[PDB]
Amino acid sequence: MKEFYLTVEQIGDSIFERYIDSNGRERTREVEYKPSLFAHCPESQATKYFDIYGKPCTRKLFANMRDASQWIKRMEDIGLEALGMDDFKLAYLSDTYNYEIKYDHTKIRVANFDIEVTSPDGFPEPSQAKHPIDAITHYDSIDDRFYVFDLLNSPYGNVEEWSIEIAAKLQEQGGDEVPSEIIDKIIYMPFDNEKELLMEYLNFWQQKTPVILTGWNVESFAIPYVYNRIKNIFGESTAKRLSPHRKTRVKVIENMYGSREIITLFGISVLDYIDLYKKFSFTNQPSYSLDYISEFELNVGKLKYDGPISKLRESNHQRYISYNIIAVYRVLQIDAKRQFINLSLDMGYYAKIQIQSVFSPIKTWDAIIFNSLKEQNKVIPQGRSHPVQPYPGAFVKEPIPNRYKYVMSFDLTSLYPSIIRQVNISPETIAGTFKVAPLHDYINAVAERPSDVYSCSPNGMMYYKDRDGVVPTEITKVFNQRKEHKGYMLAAQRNGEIIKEALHNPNLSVDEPLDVDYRFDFSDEIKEKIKKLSAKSLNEMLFRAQRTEVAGMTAQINRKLLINSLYGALGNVWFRYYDLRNATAITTFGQMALQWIERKVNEYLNEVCGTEGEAFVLYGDTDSIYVSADKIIDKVGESKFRDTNHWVDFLDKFARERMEPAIDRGFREMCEYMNNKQHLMFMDREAIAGPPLGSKGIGGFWTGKKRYALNVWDMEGTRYAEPKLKIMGLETQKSSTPKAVQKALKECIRRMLQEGEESLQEYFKEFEKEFRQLNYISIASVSSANNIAKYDVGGFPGPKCPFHIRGILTYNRAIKGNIDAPQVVEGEKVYVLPLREGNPFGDKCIAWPSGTEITDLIKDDVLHWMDYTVLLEKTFIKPLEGFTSAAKLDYEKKASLFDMFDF
DNA sequence: CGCTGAATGACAGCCGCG
């Protein structure tokens, strides 16, 4: 097989690497790597190395990586550029694997673990590990086994061995329902004392050292704990064995609210699944706890249990161990869905970087470009520092708050990457500048054409149209690879049909399947040989056909991630190819683009409607615009459509047959006006929305920028079974809005867009007569807890003290001197709730622990005093009032018209 | 931790007012 690398590190003047060799064996090797950097030399010195600006360059092969850095610092002092790949690990990688890295994941040891640590004095600080580690479940992908390390005796208790038979039984039988899928894959090892367990674990860790290390919060908790527990008991020398190179570094990460520390295990790739989730799930969750995430993804969480975990080991050591096993398994299941691990490996090996680096857009791209410029003997610029200066971004239209009956939205494909290609924006293609007229002037096409020689951007930048830019070349490559791989998937779909005769005409001649590449559909070669094939081969063959169906996805979707991250890197100063002007070039071009087309779409709809000045585009945001299709539906007359679907098709047709063409003509002119290297401004009809035909619904409405709701029937050409509610910004998308309320608001909107004013009015009134009766906990809100220890004066409200941080305290006070009642904390979220006046509790409100009910020591009265009125008002009404005033609807009869005037 | 602007709205305070 073709060998590859697992991990790489630089320790002193040597490169330590773990890797898979020609025969599948894992190997570790040290290398006295010789880095090569470059300096600008005299043109009269014929060579083969040039930078992205064509200037000739001389290679400087150093003795060791230190001289290399010594030179870089020396150069910086003199004031002359030091070109080349300074991250010697990256260079080492390009150099050792200059080719298409094909890895065999079944050889990559990916470990998933979780530990349990009984503590009665609160959350166990990892940087101290004051308490014993009483459990460790460490799943290993090579052995496909769960290794359980159970501590039978500790200062907190002595317990019996965990029973696997009991773990398998059902809940009603006193079991733990440990799934049958893994019941046979568990390897239980009980221990008499912690030291015996830790040492056996550490030994286990050498026999099977992880390459990829994951789990939930494993990098902020598990790893740091285990490391410090072991260090505090056996000394740092034994602790550093967790690293295959016996090297570890404490890394102190610090944010805008403080700091914590994680432990770097040289020779290991830590892809903590929580982080692997927060960055590839694309969706905000009100809680990122494994229980919350596991439920949201598999309709089931972590084992249930009675009492506080703090006492779960003692009172029920059986559940305790099972719990720890299910927690490790949940992660594995959540990854059986997301493939974020495979995604990572794939992305990392494509760019030839350290797997954990995929969390870094900058690093991934830096690496992909460096390998490209390397193949063509070019030398990358030298990273330089730049002030952190903000630049303008996307144009957002100030929508006129109102209901909007019929709406059609068009979007622009990969806006920014597209813009970079069309204008040819790169640092080495900057040709010059030009006097800049007000932006609107270019929007209205009444400004002296920038230049007839170079590709332009509304901010005054000009680019060469002959040269193919470094940045744009690279995106165009990824852009093609995508169509390429997602091209193989369109084929594996044609072979999944031809090879879809499991019982159609399965001949009875036992034969062997074929080696035809499903990437490329069949012709006659093997296409002919699909009949005489038995009913058995047909199935073993489609097993090899579908398998590729996903193969493309991994790469194609992985390319989509790349494409979409390029902008961020380009706008970040720590990027080798960053350029303030180029970033602004991009952003401003887009501002122009989106508004140029708004002018065009308006002008075009005004002619086809014989209207004058009418404003058809009602809202635009970055890469999309929404048009009011009212004036259109009216030419044809609303009373002439057989039903909802009739007018949807009418709009769908007018879109594809009339607007798109007018749109492309529009962008094609813009491309000429800016004298761009290539027209790439492509818009697509997106959604079509409106109320159900023959109903009193309003269809849609905007509250303001980033805040609207539509009733969509067809999206990008996919006619829904039932209309879909598309809501942006409104509180029903507010991860911080109660659930009972987040529901109504949703219902309220639906009744507004599809049923009408009387419907909304009948709901609202009921939701009031029955708000009390609603579960008392189905009301509280949500929010992050930052600087909690800033607005506390002896645990009291200080200056600018937020509304929750105050309740928090009238809770600490109502139960002061007690750790038997739910314990609060920071970085979390709490149930907030207003209390009437004259309440013996503390303030106007009172917050408390999330995911829990109020301790029966304050529960009884809290409810007795809670403010329902104030609660309904600020969480339900205020926002509805907001929706209905915009949509010009009343949620309550006898309301007065004048109330809408600002006099 | 990790990549960028553009914009909501909930609360806290100030100011200004016969």
Added chain:
DNA sequence: GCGGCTGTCATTCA
């Protein structure tokens, strides 16, 4: 009392 700002704090579209 209460608009009319202003600046924090949180979250979300692009």
